[PDB]
Amino acid sequence: GLFGAIAGFIENAWEGMIDG
């Protein structure tokens, strides 16, 4: 269930690493 929630974290783990 966590590994599936990561996707939700990508919104921060991504957008963050994207800085934009």
Query: What is the chain's Cα-based Rg?
Result: 9
Cα dihedral: 8, 9, 12, 18 (round 10)? -90
CA dihedral 11, 14, 19, 20 (to 10 degrees): -50
* Amino acid at site 7: A
The 3-class secondary structure across the chain, one letter per residue, is: CHHHHHHHHHHHHCHHHHCC
Q: What is the number of residues in the chain?
A: 20
Taking the alpha carbons of 15, 12, 9, 13 in that order, is the dihedral positive or negative? positive
Distance, CA of 13 to CA of 1 (rounded, Å): 18
For residue 2, what are its two tokens? Answer: 């966590």
17: how many CB neighbours lie within 10 A of its CB? 8
